[PDB]
């Protein structure tokens, strides 16, 4: 994906993180586990919720067909009426299918972006104090217990 | 000791399309296209449709004797008519400006039928004899119940001069007709006079109908022809009839009590004993989807019609194996 | 020692919408929707509209005596007509193919009125008596100034055979009429002959009008009816009139000098003494916006109409607190 | 935003940079101040100017309503005419509202991108010679006067 | 020792537009708009068009003597007609509901011409004399070959009562006419009777035509007027003619053998001796582009018409100097 | 471009890489040359191929004009018919021109993204073991022969 994190340098998702959309896995002497990052998850939830609502709203004023009858010697106007009603239903069908297609791609990339931004936020804190593994993980140089671990998660470190 | 950044996967099988890639599996999705309906005709917000069955709008309004179910109909929400109603125009003919009339109906929810000229109002002409075997009621020769086929009395057709004033607040739909016999003999036989006319006058209408007497194909065993006309008589206006034969005359007319949003939908379905907020010709819709792909012609609080087979938005992220 | 990368903020309050977020404050923006107009009817590029006021297009062309302001009108840019003009058709009737005529006018900027048959051209018939109190001028019984209501002279209506040749380069709009009396007595009274006809001929027109004599409602105290017809007489073609009564006859006709882009706009507004490049029925527009949301029906160098309340593009960046 | 710089790792904008859209703040013994980066600002100005012009042009051929009259017994065609004129005005209103919505989001992200690219350009020069602070700033290891400072800005360093 | 990441450049000159930048040179591109055609009218999938040349659809169907090339035409794929065909309606007139007829034709690929009333079927009336010099064939006075201009025999016009039954499975297009003389003398001269009528009857048609006798402009040296009518006679239905003069009568009628997708295209081009899958009025198209900008009115397997001058997609990347 | 690689930190393309869309140039004691990265090139080829096919498909249901005639006294309906047919052809022309414009920009950025992702993939492997030059190149600290070079290309190193 455009931002290179999802199914890119981070090879796959986490079944064990039931908690939110993005977060951390940690691993040390005391144990290991997952913690959702709630700020970026909620931010992600708001964006996608507004997008869906924007999409639905923007489409609430589509063309509505009206029943309309014509006798045997009004074939030109009947056909005109037909091609007009079908013409609009085609315009709106295309409008709807493409909006979904384009926006689906924007949504996938947005998630990717959020994952990369969160990765970088942690990278910028750790700096020298850890080896960047290449896979979404940082290996610490000096032992890092749960409170140190909590420290990376909330954005305080060193 | 190690900390990692990562994202959610789950057991989702939900798929979305993009421009560059079809069938991407996503952790979460939102389908926005309603594909289902209940396959019945239902009431719209409690208010039952007018279901014509085997009767056409013409057959109903003129009062074809096969259409008695519709002598007096309650306020409707929409009207349903079959593609080819069998009980239309029992005595062959045309209905003048029929589609422009149908168009008025799509903006009307209620008629109240009132008598304008009483059948027992004709002293100089025979009312009770204008009946055909092509319009049967209970095995006997009958006729459109709302118009009176006037025939000569004691071998005479005096000039008719009859007039109706609209003392209703409401608009009134008035219907009349003319008979086109197929030869000179029939003209003599029914109306006595060889050369006839019907003349209709309102404040905006200046009509003079003249019978077109020619030989033509039998339709349902009939060579004659009826041609029906209509007008909307404004409140406080008067309609002036004048004829010396061939006059098919108003008995009943319709008061336009209520104007409501409505349609005449084409459907072969019968009544389903249900209620709904959204009706299509193929079945009713109950959903909170923005779109549906059932049928273009709906009435009610309806989703927008698209021609798609599938409309699914991504919400979650690309789901991994 | 430190160097930093950063971006601009300012005191901007300007807001734009996106798909994922409404009301983002941006450092800079560009509004592209014109929401304002001057509320007047104005000249279009110096060229004043034809403002009918209380006269309808029919009232103008036939020359209703209440419409004298429009005896001779200069080249216009567009025409303005009220929704329900009071001075139309002072003597009740219809104007045949009226909307197709109005449609021709929307592609015409100038008429020049010329006399085709002079009133003092009728030797065998009474011109000066065809006048009604329903068409008053200065307290006296008058009539449409461009057509002549011909009546019998010394109790006779000889067959009229009159013909006009178009020796103008231009196309010529020709108007005539027919009177439908309400009884046999009036027919005798005005035209003598019981059974009449008007016949009109050009190279493409084959017309025969026959009076429809029936009893009908009074409209402005009148039971009779006028029915007006028109044709566009090509240059070098001749119109052939022939009638033995009921003929409302051409006196003046219109030369179609200029064809220009124009409309008949519906507006209750009067003249505003302004100039503009873009006119709507509600007011004029002066702007360099691409869009506007004033009214769909404009004329001139106009922005495109959208139904939006707001169209604002971001140019700058997300502005911080 | 997608690129993580604007209102992301760089917390807020600069009231004191009146000069252009992106630039630098520097701070040393001699003093401190702002300098717009004119190349990327101008590049940004050209892109947004063309976008506006593209948007305006693409819309110069919308549907124009024509006045059109009908008598009392032409109600079917009057209604057809109505629903046709409204149908187009709805298509164009949607076209215009969505183009603006989608492009507004593209413009915001473009600015973000430009800020990130400029950040990275400086990061790639400094390399080891400075501590990446995590906030848009680089703290130098060896004293950096105005000419050294000018040196980062023009793209010459070391 | 050094490793570098990089991307492709080549010698491409191909350019694409974006929202923010026009004329970006790209390494690879895909043009999707067809700008070329062969400038000829061609067969559509082997099946040659009906190319009318100087004949109009009216001139063809009525059988204008100048249109003999089209006495018997094979199944076509589409029909081509010039904007202003010279050989139409050699004797001046109108063709009633002409455009609704043309509309039927756009959904018809084949006619088979059959004789319904034989010319040598008239015992009481003169067939062979209904001919004009305005409709010449080989220097002699002639007439529309498919209709018979009946004239009086031995100074008499007996009432005609003729009837045709459709014993073809197919629908049958039937054409007839009426002559409008320009004075009372011509009526006497041709038909004897002063006051005439033509009456046509089918199961759905109730027609009575009456000659409109008035003085009018000469058109191609003629003051008279022909007015042609048509109906589609259903299989097993009968058409009933009855007239005492002015009757232009069916000789030949058309069997509607094949219904196919077709159009009447307007084009001044003649036959090009080519085959194609896609025809425009300006030339044929052979391409696998999704779009083209040739002309809106095509027939066949065609790309979609857009009004663009240029539609080019990027596939490769921004190409460097 | 949005991702800063194409005609950004990597100044220009390679005439000498005839092989694919993205790849590597290497240079050592044994010699120098180009090698296309086939995985990301093919990935790029699939995306662009599907986009073109999606664009073509989505447009296969545009409005088709039908010939339709009217007499001298049907000018209102003729004009209605005209403005209706032109109205749709304008909607579709705009639809097509804009889809191309927007998607062209998406395609250019996609290529940029792919180049950046490939750059980062190599950067994450090399880590300390090479100087990041700022220009798309990595200068090795310890001699790197062809097999070492092949090692970076396939994603195995150290
Ligand atoms: C009013 C009247 O005389 N009706 C009689 C008609 C008429 O002779 C024809 O319908 C005239 O067209 O014929 C029959 C019928 O159709 O049943 C019997 C009926 O009593
Ligand atoms: C030409 C003529 O005789 N006009 C007279 C008319 C007619 O009797 C009716 O309008 C015929 O319909 O009646 C009055 C009127 O309306 O003012 C007086 C007028 O002098
Ligand atoms: C049937 C008939 O008598 N045709 C004659 C006509 C008619 O007198 C007028 O066309 C009647 O309108 O005039 C001429 C002509 O036009 O060539 C000679 C022709 O023989
Ligand atoms: C996931 O899928 C499995 C199997 O379909 C199902 O048992 C489970 O309820 C789903 N949801 C969760 C929470 O796993
Ligand atoms: C996508 O998956 C669906 C299964 O619902 C399948 O029918 C369709 O052919 C697939 N499309 C492609 C191009 O893979
Ligand atoms: C910014 O806003 C303030 C207050 O609205 C105003 O005084 C000032 O002129 C605006 N522009 C600048 C340059 O600050
Ligand atoms: C956006 O701000 C406007 C103020 O003009 C307000 O009316 C509107 O409700 C706001 N919309 C949302 C969803 O915040
Ligand atoms: C590139 O362009 C040159 C000159 O136009 C031409 O000779 C060559 O065939 C093209 N393709 C290649 C492979 O260079
Ligand atoms: C783009 O290049 C074309 C050459 O085909 C030229 O005609 C056009 O003016 C150029 N447009 C711009 C804005 O550079």
Author numbering:
A (entry chain F), D (entry chain F), F (entry chain F): 1 to 158
B (entry chain E), C (entry chain E), E (entry chain E): 5 to 325
Lines quoted from the article behind this entry:
Introduction of a more bulky Val134 side-chain in the mutant, in place of the highly conserved Ala134 in wild type HA, increases the width of the hydrophobic channel between the 130- and 220-loops that form the front and left edges of the receptor-binding site. As a consequence, the H-bond between Gln222 and Ser132 is not formed in the mutant. In the Ala134Val mutant–LSTc complex, only Sia-1 was detected, suggesting slightly weaker binding of the human receptor analog (LSTc), than to the wild type HA. The crystallographic structure of the HA–receptor complexes provided an explanation for the poor receptor binding by the Ala134Val mutant HA, namely that distortion of the binding site by the bulkier valine residue would potentially cause a reduction in the strength of H-bonds between receptor and binding site. The consequent increased width of the site is more akin to that of human H3 (and H9) viruses with their preference for α2-6-sialyl receptors. Detailed analyses of the binding properties of the recombinant viruses containing the Ala134Val substitution, observed in virus isolated from a fatal case of H5N1 infection after 4 days of illness, showed consistently that binding to α2-3-sialyl sequences was reduced, but with no detectable increase in binding to the repertoire of α2-6-sialyl sequences examined. In contrast, there was little discernible effect on agglutination of guinea pig RBCs by the Ala134Val substitution despite weak binding to the α2-6-sialyl sequences included in this study. Repeated identification of the Ala134Val substitution in clade 1 human H5N1 isolates, but not in contemporary clade 1 viruses isolated from birds, emphasizes its potential significance in human infection.
